[PDB]
Amino acid sequence: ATCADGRTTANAACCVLFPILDDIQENLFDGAQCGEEVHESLRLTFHDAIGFSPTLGGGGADGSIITFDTIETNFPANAGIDEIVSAQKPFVAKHNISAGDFIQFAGAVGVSNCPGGVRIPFFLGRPDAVAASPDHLVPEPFDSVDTILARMGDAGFSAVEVVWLLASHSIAAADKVDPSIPGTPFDSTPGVFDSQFFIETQLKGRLFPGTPDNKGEVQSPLQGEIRLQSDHLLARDPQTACEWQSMVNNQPKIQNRFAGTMSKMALLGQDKSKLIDCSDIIPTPPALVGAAHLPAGFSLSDVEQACAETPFPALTADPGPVTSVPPVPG
Ligand code: HEM
Ligand SMILES: [Ca+2]
Ligand SMILES: [Ca+2]
């Protein structure tokens, strides 16, 4: 099909997405960069979608976090999500797709900007949100593994799927876990969708990058990197540790499982058969940059092996002395 903007797509209903793509690439993502706004937009996909429980209710990936922001903005786990909601609102107001569609579209487009990224399937047609999410459906970094897995499981995800979705933390930072050091990433390559997150979370902690005593934080192995308590525990818990380790230096697995599981997440509360497949609108991501490695100055003895069936793979360290990770600008 040929669209009003002159471009081609398989299903002509998807043409509406091309001007939206252009607008977000320029005016939300700072020229199609894998930076702060991409990261926040990706987090928003999860906070919107995970507000779904067959028991407790919630419409899932329905745009409620924007449309009912006056309610959802007050939820504890939504700390620091108000900035990206505020940034997305004028786009939702200005274009002609639902808020639920916009959130998932912006997330998929954003991931496609990141070197090593993957094209996440995208469907068009989510109805407008009808009610705010119930509170307390977003997992917290101070929740135990069993609590996190139970909540994610309630929404429909297996333990391995939780690990796959946490590849998102490869392109990610924290502003509120330790508010003294906003923009501190979870891996040494927050601009690259890669396995460094799965490697670096497996290292023995060494230091707090900022203040001590923050809820939901534990010691990190690197200055300028922050470690969530939840990620620390998920990397080591027998339910998840072998799957976590299996992501290390397996870029195709990270990509394919992230795409598939993100598609599932983007469809929480929705019925694929009542939507239109517009996956071909998502751009081709740049190739992976870099290769899997231990940080400079580290060795296998710094890895806390936690997979009972399989040893941690032999990686090479970057050359030189131990170095710090720069924060995400913004
Ligand atoms: C499984 C349980 C999870 C927990 C406990 C968790 C927790 C967190 C926390 C505490 C932050 C830092 C927020 C801040 O202080 O600014 C964060 C950031 C982030 N999370 Fe997760 N997360 C989880 C799952 C996910 C999933 C499934 C996604 C998928 C989209 C995701 C995507 C992100 C992204 C992209 C960021 C970076 C945001 C930024 O750079 O500002 N998280 N997560
Ligand atoms: Ca929602
Ligand atoms: Ca990374």
Residue numbers in the entry: 2 to 331
Reproduce the article's own wording on this structure:
The overall structure of VP1 and MnP4 showed a heme group dividing the protein into a distal largely helical domain (formed by four main helices and two to three small ones) with one structural calcium ion, and a proximal domain composed by another six helices and a non-ordered region stabilized by a second calcium ion. The site where this takes place is conserved and comprises three acidic residues (E36/E40/D175 in VP1 and E36/E40/D181 in MnP4) located near the heme propionate occupying the most internal position with respect to the main access channel.
The resulting inventory revealed the absence of lignin peroxidases (LiPs) and the presence of three versatile peroxidases (VPs) and six manganese peroxidases (MnPs), the crystal structures of two of them (VP1 and MnP4) were solved at 1.0 to 1.1 Å showing significant structural differences. As already described for P. eryngii VPL, the main structural feature of the P. ostreatus VP1 crystal structure is the combination of the Mn oxidation site of MnPs and the high redox potential substrate oxidation site of LiPs. This site in VP1 would consist of W164, connected to the heme group via a long-range electron transfer (LRET). The lower lip in VP1 presents a clear negative charge and the shape of a wide reservoir, while in MnP4 it displays a less charged surface with a narrow groove (circles in Figure 5C). VP1 is the most stable POD retaining over 80% activity after 10 minutes up to 60°C, followed by MnP4, VP3, MnP1, and VP2 (although the VP2 stability sharply decreased with incubation time).
